Scaffold this active site. Structure first.
Site, short mmCIF file in Angstrom:
data_model
loop_
_atom_site.label_atom_id
_atom_site.label_comp_id
_atom_site.label_asym_id
_atom_site.label_seq_id
_atom_site.Cartn_x
_atom_site.Cartn_y
_atom_site.Cartn_z
N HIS A 164 -31.24 14.16 5.90
CA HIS A 164 -30.05 13.65 5.23
C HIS A 164 -29.71 14.35 3.95
O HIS A 164 -28.54 14.49 3.61
CB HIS A 164 -30.21 12.19 4.91
CG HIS A 164 -30.16 11.32 6.11
ND1 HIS A 164 -29.03 10.60 6.46
CD2 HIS A 164 -31.10 11.04 7.05
CE1 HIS A 164 -29.28 9.93 7.57
NE2 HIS A 164 -30.53 10.16 7.94
N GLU A 200 -24.91 0.22 21.47
CA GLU A 200 -23.95 1.29 21.71
C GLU A 200 -22.64 0.74 22.19
O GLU A 200 -21.59 1.07 21.68
CB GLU A 200 -24.51 2.34 22.68
CG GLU A 200 -24.64 3.71 22.01
CD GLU A 200 -25.47 3.67 20.74
OE1 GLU A 200 -25.15 4.39 19.76
OE2 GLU A 200 -26.46 2.91 20.74
ZN ZN Z 1 -25.18 3.58 16.53
#
Ligand code: ZN
Ligand code: CL
Lengths: 597, 173
Positions: A487, A357
């Site tokens: 998706h 992250e």
């Molecule tokens: Zn990510």
């Protein structure tokens, strides 16, 4: 003055305006996702509704400047973006219908639930009811049930909508001078007017296919190898030449063969590459995790997270009485405010996660000097690769020792390493073919090469030829399987996952080279690498600024998506498998079936 | 008399910056010397004491401050406030986030982002007239009309690049 000079002055007004509304919409979602109040949820829409109204107003106002009358690359690049004409080119009533179509699908997918015919009252939804079954259960039938229920209830339900969805979204696509909605997405990878750094929406398909070929052999063998292991798992249900059954692949679609490690593990004996218990013993806390990640980048020539990051981010779950959605997320709210929302537990996975992250956050800072519209990764898949490069180096035992979470006197024996790769392969290489064949069929449906009445006779034709997988029960046009995956039924480019994967290895390689790295390309940890970080930044700092192919050059060394660095990573595996498959059969027959009838 | 400009309770927008003329006064400059209250003290002249002055003041974004110095392209140095290539004294700043910024957003401070031509050292422009990139009286919403003034929006949470900072330019004569 020239259309250009007016346009310079148009964008400038926009940058400063967007900055404000965008920072308002951002800030709102932050306050929401971290404190799900009832007053909080309201403006989280308002701000965002204002901001989305601003673009509509702006984009259609940017229609005034004919881009085909300008030259300062950047200005043209910015305006091009701003002309997000989009699905307003339709008639107001078609767009109404379309956004309803979209909206319903999204709702159906999350709300959809199935009931145990053998028990009226117990009923489950994908997450977490079914997903648990699909990832854990060793019962063939139970598996076959979950898998079918889903594609049967919600699948069929989304069949009518997706049918309409295709025509409309195609209409939208054709209106903006694109061949189909398919040709629209390939758009993301397009580059014009630069020389050699150019790229076209057709050539994606060429390069994604030319690359996917070199992957086959490795895939074929990984295929063959897990096949044989599965045969033991569910004896008498698999054919030593035939495809794998779709429901025994470890999640709801076999997107990832991660969950099969359990029963495909090469050497069940070598055990814990897992410092969870070691971090706990040194009383590591949230603070320590992130401070350590921060240290990692600092080590390569990058900046300490901003004081704004440390006193604004939310690094732990704030218990009950104040609730949050705990998906680990990197936030670039703009105005130089960056932060992370992560409900940290002291475990290796989160130690890893947080390095990923802080990857994007690091990326976000890099390109924040760029004009407002050019802040963002060089293409749909660029941000994820950079984020995953960090997980690769922070995982090695080299780093883990370096930081005193791995007891100094551990050995890197050959067996533990095979075990590793297979785990890596199951995810990284499992999905690559499954993915390609996903957008292959999507792409086709969009180019109109598949008649509505053969939407499954074509799905599984490919599922058996590309992926080596078979439906456990036959599926006619009543079902709509490709859309049982988020998706798909929630409108998303999926090739991103195929191109990022390649990218991410082209990165690690050129970087471990730069960092000077001894062993196999996977023993690599790029810490303290300084000069190996510089090369990263060199591209990280562009964002959407230059053509993506240049964006890449700066790191790897050439203008294209090259597959070999992924294959290098897996040499130690690939070979050990050619061996294992000694007596196993490699490859499959498309003809064989589970139901067989 | 310096207590009246620093320590002061309200500051102006760069575009309409205020000059104070301090003469006859005696001050030791020791009020300013010692203090980790300031973040910028670049003195393009010297640093001593003979006990003798112009004292302009205003507010800019953080990353804006680096333009209160000789040279520097602009937007701020081009359009709101400009120091001369030479004739100088000192420049002073301080993070007034707690004061000039709120968690909800403070859009009171302005700056200019469009003008025909650049400013002259120590010039000012308090005009607020619809701007078109070629004379011609603008009339919003007519296309290519913009109001040349803009708000800053100072939130407490923003990066240090975007926090409010008060400035005092001291000029010597
Ligand atoms: Zn990510
Ligand atoms: Cl499927």
């Amino acid at each position: 003055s020239t259309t250009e000079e007016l346009a310079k002055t148009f964008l400038e007004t926009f940058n400063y305006e967007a900055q404000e509304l965008s920072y308002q919409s951002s800030v709102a979602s932050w306050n929401y996702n971290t404190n799900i109040t009832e007053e909080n949820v309201q403006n989280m829409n308002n701000a965002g509704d204002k901001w989305s109204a601003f673009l509509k107003e702006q984009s259609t106002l940017a229609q005034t400047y004919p881009l085909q009358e300008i030259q300062n690359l950047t200005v043209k690049l910015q305006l091009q973006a701003l002309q997000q004409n989009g699905s307003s080119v339709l008639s107001e009533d078609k767009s109404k219908r379309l956004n309803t179509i979209l909206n319903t699908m999204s709702t159906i997918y999350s709300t959809g639930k199935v009931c145990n015919p053998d028990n009226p009252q117990e009923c489950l939804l994908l997450e977490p009811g079914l997903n648990e079954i699909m990832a854990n259960s060793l019962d063939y039938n139970e598996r076959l049930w979950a898998w079918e229920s889903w594609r049967s209830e919600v699948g069929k339900q989304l069949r009518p909508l997706y049918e309409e969805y295709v025509v409309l979204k195609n209409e939208m696509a054709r209106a903006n001078h694109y061949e189909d909605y398919g040709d629209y997405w390939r758009g993301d990878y397009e580059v014009n007017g630069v020389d050699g750094y150019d790229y076209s929406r057709g050539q994606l398909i060429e390069d994604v296919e030319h690359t996917f070929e070199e992957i086959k052999p490795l895939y074929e063998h990984l295929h063959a190898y897990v096949r044989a292991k599965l045969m033991n798992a569910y004896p008498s249900y698999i054919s030593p030449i035939g495809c794998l059954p779709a429901h025994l692949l470890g999640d709801m679609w076999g997107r990832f063969w991660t969950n099969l490690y359990s029963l495909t593990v090469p050497f069940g004996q070598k055990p814990n590459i897992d410092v969870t218990d070691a971090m706990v013993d040194q009383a590591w806390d949230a603070q320590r995790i992130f401070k350590e990640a921060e240290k990692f980048f600092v080590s390569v020539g990058l900046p300490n997270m901003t004081q704004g990051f440390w006193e604004n981010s939310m690094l732990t779950d704030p218990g009950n009485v104040q609730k949050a959605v705990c998906h680990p997320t990197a936030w670039d709210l703009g105005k130089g405010d960056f932060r992370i929302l992560m409900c940290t537990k002291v475990t290796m996975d989160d130690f890893l996660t947080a390095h990923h992250e802080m990857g994007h956050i690091q990326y976000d800072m890099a390109y924040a000097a760029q004009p407002f519209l050019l802040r963002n990764g060089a293409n749909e898949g660029f941000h994820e690769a950079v984020g995953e490069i960090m997980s690769l180096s922070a995982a090695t035992p080299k780093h883990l020792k370096s930081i005193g979470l791995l007891s100094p006197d551990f050995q890197e024996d050959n067996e533990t390493e095979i075990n590793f790769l297979l785990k890596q392969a199951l995810t990284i290489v499992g999905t690559l073919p499954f993915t390609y064949m996903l957008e292959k069929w999507r792409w086709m449906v969009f180019k109109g090469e598949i008649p509505k009445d053969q939407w499954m006779k074509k799905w599984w034709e490919m599922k058996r030829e590309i992926v080596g997988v078979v439906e456990p029960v036959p599926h006619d046009e009543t079902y709509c399987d490709p859309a049982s995956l988020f998706h798909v039924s929630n409108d998303y480019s999926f090739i991103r996952y195929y191109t990022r994967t390649l990218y991410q290895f082209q990165f690690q390689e050129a970087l471990c080279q730069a960092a000077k790295h001894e062993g196999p390309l996977h023993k690599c940890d790029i810490s303290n690498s300084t000069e190996a970080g510089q090369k990263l930044f060199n591209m990280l700092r562009l964002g959407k600024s230059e053509p993506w192919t240049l964006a890449l050059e700066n790191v790897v060394g050439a203008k294209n998506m090259n597959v070999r660095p992924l294959l290098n990573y897996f040499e130690p595996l690939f070979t050990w498998l050619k061996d294992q498959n000694k007596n196993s059969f490699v490859g499959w027959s498309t003809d064989w079936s589970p139901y067989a009838d | 008399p310096f207590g009246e400009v620093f320590n002061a309770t309200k500051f102006p927008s760069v575009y309409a910056w205020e000059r104070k003329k301090i003469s006859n006064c005696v001050a030791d400059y020791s009020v300013l010397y010692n203090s980790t209250f300031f973040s910028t003290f670049k003195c393009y002249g010297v640093s001593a004491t003979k006990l003798n002055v112009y004292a302009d003041s205003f507010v800019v974004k953080g990353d804006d401050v680096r333009q209160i110095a000789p040279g520097q392209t602009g937007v701020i140095a081009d359009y709101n406030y400009k120091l001369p290539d030479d004739f100088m004294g000192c420049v002073l700043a301080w993070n007034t986030r707690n004061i000039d910024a709120t968690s909800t957003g403070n859009y009171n401070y302005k700056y200019r982002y469009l003008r025909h031509g650049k400013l002259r050292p120590f010039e000012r422009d308090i005009s607020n007239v619809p701007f078109s990139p070629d004379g011609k009286p603008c009339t919003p919403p007519a296309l290519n009309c913009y109001w040349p003034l803009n708000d800053y929006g100072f939130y407490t949470t923003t990066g240090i690049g975007y926090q409010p900072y008060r400035v005092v330019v001291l000029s010597f004569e």
